[PDB]
Amino acid sequence: STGSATTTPIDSLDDAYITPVQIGTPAQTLNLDFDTGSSDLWVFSSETTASEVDGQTIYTPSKSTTAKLLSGATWSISYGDGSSSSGDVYTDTVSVGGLTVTGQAVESAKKVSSSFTEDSTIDGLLGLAFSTLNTVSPTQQKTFFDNAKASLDSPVFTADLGYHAPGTYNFGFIDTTAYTGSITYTAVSTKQGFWEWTSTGYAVGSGTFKSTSIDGIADTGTTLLYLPATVVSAYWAQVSGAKSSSSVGGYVFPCSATLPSFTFGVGSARIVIPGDYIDFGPISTGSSSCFGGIQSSAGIGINIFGDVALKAAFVVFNGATTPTLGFASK
């Protein structure tokens, strides 16, 4: 089997991407944030505290003939951005782009933090990291990908995120028309539950490539590119007037600037992030100070190849017995 679904930016900055997901019988379609940095499929629901729901589409398990309470199971998650949610668990039928899993754990939110309430466009998350990170207790549950894997034509999914445009998540096949050149594969460590890999280095603009190992995670659920302070300083030093602002919470730059590209290494291959991808616009409405898309990972504890990086590539998440990651230009 295979599946193919379009993923769409939630706003003009590509702050996140939503993908329609069918849950239950008859189908209830919710727009979920596919997140390769976590492993819970959770949704706004009829059980979510009413004051914490503001425009989201909810899953109502009592209206699904295939929903079953997973008795005794609860979940609770905190994300790197400080947001969180928790609740109980149903199993139900879940389909993504034509690919159907029966018995998928659908984690129903009883509580969500303010960041989720305030984002009307995201109805929940669909985790695509390794199932070892799933928070369901006392019986840990499998991700959608893990459940689908055995049935897929090939045990893979691909992320093809657009810049200011829709893109595609495919399950079970590699669309050879969706990228240019060849795909370069690189080793993955699953020890922390993430798609963790080591970039071979970087360049700023037309500058020479610096060969250096950068361990980090491929994370579709993080907006920006978070890298070591040394690398980030070298990037922003090439933008007149750019500075790190403790008050704003990162590097900012004059909105009048033209940003250089940023290149990262995948083995001997190179992925080029155009300068425009690194512009996240005014820090506040009407400001001439713009927020940068490359930020320091210092104090996160891990480097994160988020959407800024991933959207410059066609990315293969290979869930074979020994997982690997593939990157191609597009």
Short mmCIF file of C-alpha atoms in Angstrom, two decimals:
data_model
loop_
_atom_site.label_atom_id
_atom_site.label_comp_id
_atom_site.label_asym_id
_atom_site.label_seq_id
_atom_site.Cartn_x
_atom_site.Cartn_y
_atom_site.Cartn_z
CA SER A 1 0.00 0.00 0.00
CA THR A 2 0.89 3.66 -0.27
CA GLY A 3 -0.50 7.05 0.75
CA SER A 4 0.00 10.59 -0.56
CA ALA A 5 -1.30 13.76 1.07
CA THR A 6 -0.77 17.42 0.44
CA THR A 7 0.64 19.50 3.30
CA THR A 8 -0.17 23.22 3.43
CA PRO A 9 1.49 26.12 5.29
CA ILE A 10 -0.71 27.51 8.08
CA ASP A 11 0.29 31.11 7.36
CA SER A 12 2.35 33.37 5.10
CA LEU A 13 5.57 32.60 7.02
CA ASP A 14 5.40 28.78 6.82
CA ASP A 15 5.26 28.66 10.64
CA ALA A 16 3.97 25.10 10.36
CA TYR A 17 2.26 22.80 7.88
CA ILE A 18 -1.09 21.02 8.16
CA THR A 19 -2.13 17.79 6.48
CA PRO A 20 -5.69 16.46 6.39
CA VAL A 21 -6.20 13.18 8.26
CA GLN A 22 -9.35 11.04 8.30
CA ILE A 23 -10.26 9.63 11.72
CA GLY A 24 -13.13 7.30 12.54
CA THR A 25 -16.24 6.02 10.81
CA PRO A 26 -17.76 7.97 9.16
CA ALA A 27 -14.57 9.92 8.61
CA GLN A 28 -13.88 13.02 10.67
CA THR A 29 -11.22 15.05 8.85
CA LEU A 30 -8.82 16.98 11.07
CA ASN A 31 -5.83 19.03 9.93
CA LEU A 32 -2.79 17.74 11.78
CA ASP A 33 0.79 18.94 12.13
CA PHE A 34 2.99 16.03 11.01
CA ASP A 35 5.90 16.07 13.40
CA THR A 36 9.02 13.95 12.82
CA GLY A 37 10.26 15.15 16.23
CA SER A 38 7.56 13.48 18.33
CA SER A 39 5.61 10.24 18.46
CA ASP A 40 2.06 10.93 19.64
CA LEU A 41 -0.99 11.33 17.41
CA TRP A 42 -3.19 13.64 19.48
CA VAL A 43 -6.25 15.67 18.61
CA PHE A 44 -8.54 18.38 19.83
CA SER A 45 -11.70 16.52 20.79
CA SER A 46 -15.15 16.60 22.33
CA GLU A 47 -13.31 15.98 25.63
CA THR A 48 -11.08 19.08 25.39
CA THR A 49 -11.79 21.66 28.10
CA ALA A 50 -14.20 24.03 26.34
CA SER A 51 -12.32 27.24 27.24
CA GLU A 52 -9.21 25.78 25.55
CA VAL A 53 -10.89 25.24 22.17
CA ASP A 54 -10.91 28.29 19.82
CA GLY A 55 -11.81 27.45 16.23
CA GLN A 56 -10.20 24.00 15.92
CA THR A 57 -12.02 21.06 14.40
CA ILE A 58 -12.59 18.40 17.06
CA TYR A 59 -12.70 14.62 16.99
CA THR A 60 -15.81 13.21 18.65
CA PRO A 61 -15.23 9.53 19.37
CA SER A 62 -18.88 8.91 20.34
CA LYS A 63 -19.81 9.66 16.72
CA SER A 64 -17.39 7.05 15.36
CA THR A 65 -18.63 3.48 15.11
CA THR A 66 -15.04 2.20 15.09
CA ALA A 67 -13.76 4.16 18.11
CA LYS A 68 -12.95 2.19 21.25
CA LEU A 69 -11.72 3.58 24.55
CA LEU A 70 -8.24 2.26 25.31
CA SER A 71 -9.12 1.54 28.88
CA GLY A 72 -6.86 3.03 31.53
CA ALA A 73 -4.55 4.74 29.04
CA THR A 74 -3.46 8.35 29.47
CA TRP A 75 -0.93 10.60 27.81
CA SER A 76 0.88 13.84 28.56
CA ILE A 77 3.45 15.60 26.42
CA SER A 78 5.65 18.69 26.58
CA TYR A 79 7.33 20.08 23.48
CA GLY A 80 10.61 21.94 23.02
CA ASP A 81 8.76 25.23 22.68
CA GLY A 82 7.20 24.88 26.13
CA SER A 83 3.74 23.91 24.89
CA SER A 84 1.90 20.83 26.19
CA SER A 85 -1.24 18.72 26.10
CA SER A 86 -2.70 15.66 27.82
CA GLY A 87 -5.69 13.37 27.90
CA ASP A 88 -6.96 9.84 27.37
CA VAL A 89 -6.82 7.43 24.41
CA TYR A 90 -9.07 5.78 21.85
CA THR A 91 -8.18 3.37 19.11
CA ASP A 92 -9.81 4.11 15.76
CA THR A 93 -9.30 3.92 12.00
CA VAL A 94 -6.94 6.60 10.67
CA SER A 95 -6.26 7.33 7.02
CA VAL A 96 -3.69 9.63 5.46
CA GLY A 97 -3.82 10.27 1.73
CA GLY A 98 -5.50 6.94 1.02
CA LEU A 99 -3.39 4.84 3.42
CA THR A 100 -5.47 3.31 6.21
CA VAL A 101 -4.42 2.01 9.63
CA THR A 102 -6.95 0.25 11.81
CA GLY A 103 -6.50 0.25 15.59
CA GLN A 104 -4.42 3.44 15.63
CA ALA A 105 -4.03 5.08 19.03
CA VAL A 106 -5.78 8.46 18.79
CA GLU A 107 -4.89 10.51 21.84
CA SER A 108 -7.81 12.70 22.82
CA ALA A 109 -6.88 15.98 24.49
CA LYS A 110 -8.56 16.89 27.73
CA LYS A 111 -6.16 19.82 28.19
CA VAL A 112 -3.98 21.83 25.81
CA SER A 113 -1.66 24.77 26.54
CA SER A 114 -2.40 28.30 25.37
CA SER A 115 -0.16 28.08 22.29
CA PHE A 116 -2.39 25.32 20.90
CA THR A 117 -5.66 27.07 21.77
CA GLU A 118 -4.41 30.24 20.08
CA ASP A 119 -3.62 28.46 16.81
CA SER A 120 -7.00 27.83 15.19
CA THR A 121 -5.43 26.12 12.17
CA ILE A 122 -3.86 23.09 13.92
CA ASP A 123 -6.30 20.40 15.09
CA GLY A 124 -3.58 18.20 16.59
CA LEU A 125 -0.25 16.51 15.89
CA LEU A 126 0.69 13.32 14.09
CA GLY A 127 4.03 12.11 15.40
CA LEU A 128 6.52 10.47 13.04
CA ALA A 129 9.57 10.03 15.29
CA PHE A 130 10.28 6.58 16.76
CA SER A 131 7.60 4.92 18.87
CA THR A 132 9.98 4.75 21.84
CA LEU A 133 9.07 8.43 22.46
CA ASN A 134 5.32 7.82 22.60
CA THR A 135 3.93 9.08 25.91
CA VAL A 136 0.92 6.76 26.39
CA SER A 137 0.89 5.06 29.79
CA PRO A 138 0.83 2.35 30.99
CA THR A 139 1.05 0.75 27.53
CA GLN A 140 3.15 2.70 25.04
CA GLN A 141 1.55 3.03 21.60
CA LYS A 142 2.90 2.92 18.05
CA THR A 143 3.00 5.80 15.58
CA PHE A 144 0.91 5.83 12.44
CA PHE A 145 4.04 5.06 10.39
CA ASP A 146 5.05 2.19 12.65
CA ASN A 147 1.56 0.67 12.36
CA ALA A 148 1.47 1.12 8.57
CA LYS A 149 5.02 -0.04 7.90
CA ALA A 150 4.52 -3.74 7.25
CA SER A 151 1.76 -3.01 4.71
CA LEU A 152 3.68 -0.35 2.80
CA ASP A 153 5.27 -1.15 -0.54
CA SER A 154 8.55 0.16 0.95
CA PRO A 155 9.06 1.04 4.63
CA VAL A 156 9.55 4.76 4.04
CA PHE A 157 7.86 8.11 4.13
CA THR A 158 8.99 11.32 2.45
CA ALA A 159 8.63 14.99 3.33
CA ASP A 160 8.54 17.52 0.48
CA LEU A 161 7.71 20.81 2.18
CA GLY A 162 7.04 23.91 0.11
CA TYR A 163 8.40 27.41 0.48
CA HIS A 164 5.33 29.64 0.78
CA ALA A 165 3.47 26.86 -1.06
CA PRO A 166 1.91 23.44 -0.48
CA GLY A 167 3.98 20.26 -0.52
CA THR A 168 3.57 16.54 -0.03
CA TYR A 169 3.93 13.71 2.47
CA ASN A 170 4.17 10.30 0.78
CA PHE A 171 4.05 6.94 2.52
CA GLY A 172 5.44 3.73 1.07
CA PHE A 173 7.15 5.03 -2.08
CA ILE A 174 9.74 7.49 -3.35
CA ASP A 175 8.40 9.82 -6.08
CA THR A 176 11.37 10.03 -8.42
CA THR A 177 9.79 13.02 -10.22
CA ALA A 178 9.81 15.14 -7.06
CA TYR A 179 13.54 15.87 -6.85
CA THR A 180 16.55 16.66 -9.01
CA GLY A 181 19.81 14.72 -9.13
CA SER A 182 20.28 11.84 -6.74
CA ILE A 183 19.25 11.19 -3.14
CA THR A 184 22.18 11.05 -0.69
CA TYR A 185 21.55 8.77 2.27
CA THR A 186 23.12 9.22 5.67
CA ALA A 187 23.20 7.22 8.92
CA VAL A 188 20.60 7.68 11.66
CA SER A 189 20.90 7.14 15.40
CA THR A 190 17.62 6.20 17.08
CA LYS A 191 19.13 6.31 20.58
CA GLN A 192 17.19 9.44 21.57
CA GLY A 193 14.07 8.42 19.61
CA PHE A 194 14.62 11.01 16.88
CA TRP A 195 15.69 10.97 13.24
CA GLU A 196 19.15 12.01 14.40
CA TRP A 197 21.97 12.34 11.88
CA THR A 198 25.29 14.14 11.33
CA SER A 199 25.67 16.87 8.74
CA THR A 200 29.14 17.12 7.23
CA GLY A 201 29.36 20.91 7.39
CA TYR A 202 28.12 24.25 6.11
CA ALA A 203 28.71 27.31 3.95
CA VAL A 204 27.39 30.86 4.19
CA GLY A 205 26.41 32.42 0.87
CA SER A 206 29.12 31.98 -1.74
CA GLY A 207 31.70 31.31 0.97
CA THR A 208 33.91 28.27 1.24
CA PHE A 209 32.46 25.11 2.74
CA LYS A 210 33.51 24.32 6.31
CA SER A 211 33.88 20.60 6.94
CA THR A 212 32.64 19.92 10.43
CA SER A 213 30.33 17.33 11.98
CA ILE A 214 26.98 18.72 13.16
CA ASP A 215 24.74 16.21 14.95
CA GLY A 216 21.06 17.11 14.83
CA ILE A 217 17.51 15.95 14.19
CA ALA A 218 15.30 16.15 11.12
CA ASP A 219 12.21 17.73 12.64
CA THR A 220 9.25 18.73 10.50
CA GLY A 221 7.46 20.03 13.60
CA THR A 222 10.03 22.75 14.31
CA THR A 223 9.81 25.91 12.19
CA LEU A 224 13.41 27.11 12.22
CA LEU A 225 16.97 25.84 11.78
CA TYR A 226 18.78 25.64 15.15
CA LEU A 227 22.56 25.18 14.97
CA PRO A 228 25.64 25.72 17.16
CA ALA A 229 26.33 29.31 18.17
CA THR A 230 29.58 29.37 16.19
CA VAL A 231 27.79 28.45 12.93
CA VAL A 232 24.91 30.86 13.55
CA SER A 233 27.27 33.76 14.37
CA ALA A 234 29.17 33.11 11.14
CA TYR A 235 25.91 33.29 9.18
CA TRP A 236 24.55 36.51 10.71
CA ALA A 237 27.95 38.22 10.52
CA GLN A 238 27.30 38.36 6.75
CA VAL A 239 24.13 40.45 7.22
CA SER A 240 24.69 44.16 7.89
CA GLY A 241 22.99 45.23 11.09
CA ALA A 242 22.06 41.75 12.26
CA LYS A 243 22.34 41.07 15.97
CA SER A 244 21.28 38.69 18.68
CA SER A 245 18.57 40.30 20.77
CA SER A 246 17.96 38.86 24.22
CA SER A 247 14.71 40.86 24.42
CA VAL A 248 13.32 39.41 21.19
CA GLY A 249 14.76 35.93 21.82
CA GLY A 250 17.22 35.46 18.97
CA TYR A 251 18.89 36.93 15.92
CA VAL A 252 17.11 39.79 14.22
CA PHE A 253 18.10 41.72 11.13
CA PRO A 254 17.05 44.84 9.24
CA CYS A 255 14.05 44.04 7.08
CA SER A 256 15.81 46.00 4.32
CA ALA A 257 18.55 43.33 4.09
CA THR A 258 19.10 40.77 1.39
CA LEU A 259 19.93 37.50 3.13
CA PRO A 260 22.66 35.13 1.96
CA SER A 261 21.93 31.48 1.36
CA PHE A 262 23.01 28.78 3.80
CA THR A 263 24.34 25.42 2.65
CA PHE A 264 24.47 22.25 4.74
CA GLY A 265 26.30 19.03 3.96
CA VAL A 266 24.79 15.58 3.61
CA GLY A 267 27.75 13.29 3.07
CA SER A 268 29.55 14.72 0.02
CA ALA A 269 26.29 16.34 -1.17
CA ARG A 270 25.11 19.87 -0.45
CA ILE A 271 21.63 21.30 0.23
CA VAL A 272 21.27 25.03 -0.42
CA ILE A 273 18.75 27.03 1.62
CA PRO A 274 17.99 30.24 -0.30
CA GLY A 275 18.28 33.46 1.66
CA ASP A 276 14.57 34.21 1.35
CA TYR A 277 13.77 31.01 3.30
CA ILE A 278 15.59 32.51 6.31
CA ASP A 279 13.33 35.60 6.52
CA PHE A 280 10.56 35.30 9.15
CA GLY A 281 9.36 38.85 8.81
CA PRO A 282 8.80 41.70 11.24
CA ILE A 283 9.20 40.88 14.93
CA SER A 284 5.93 42.73 15.53
CA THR A 285 3.47 44.20 13.06
CA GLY A 286 4.98 47.23 11.31
CA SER A 287 8.49 46.76 12.70
CA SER A 288 11.54 47.15 10.48
CA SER A 289 13.36 44.51 12.55
CA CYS A 290 12.89 41.04 11.06
CA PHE A 291 13.26 37.68 12.77
CA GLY A 292 15.90 35.27 11.51
CA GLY A 293 15.25 31.71 10.43
CA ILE A 294 18.61 30.40 11.59
CA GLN A 295 19.00 30.56 15.38
CA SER A 296 21.33 29.18 18.03
CA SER A 297 20.65 25.77 19.54
CA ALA A 298 22.65 26.65 22.64
CA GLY A 299 20.53 25.73 25.63
CA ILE A 300 18.20 23.50 23.61
CA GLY A 301 20.66 20.67 24.01
CA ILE A 302 20.29 19.46 20.43
CA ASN A 303 20.66 20.89 16.91
CA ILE A 304 17.41 20.92 14.94
CA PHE A 305 17.05 20.75 11.18
CA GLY A 306 13.55 22.18 11.16
CA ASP A 307 11.34 23.35 8.30
CA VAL A 308 13.74 26.09 7.15
CA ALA A 309 16.26 23.37 6.26
CA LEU A 310 13.93 20.54 5.29
CA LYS A 311 11.86 22.59 2.87
CA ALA A 312 14.99 23.12 0.76
CA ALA A 313 15.12 19.36 0.14
CA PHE A 314 13.23 16.23 -0.73
CA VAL A 315 13.68 14.17 2.43
CA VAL A 316 13.41 10.39 2.78
CA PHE A 317 12.69 8.95 6.21
CA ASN A 318 13.74 5.34 5.66
CA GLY A 319 12.26 3.09 8.34
CA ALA A 320 14.02 -0.08 7.26
CA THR A 321 15.45 -2.30 10.02
CA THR A 322 18.44 0.02 10.07
CA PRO A 323 16.85 3.44 9.53
CA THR A 324 18.54 6.09 7.39
CA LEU A 325 17.74 9.58 6.09
CA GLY A 326 17.96 10.68 2.45
CA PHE A 327 18.25 14.21 1.09
CA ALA A 328 17.93 15.44 -2.49
CA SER A 329 17.81 18.90 -4.01
CA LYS A 330 14.56 19.80 -5.78
#
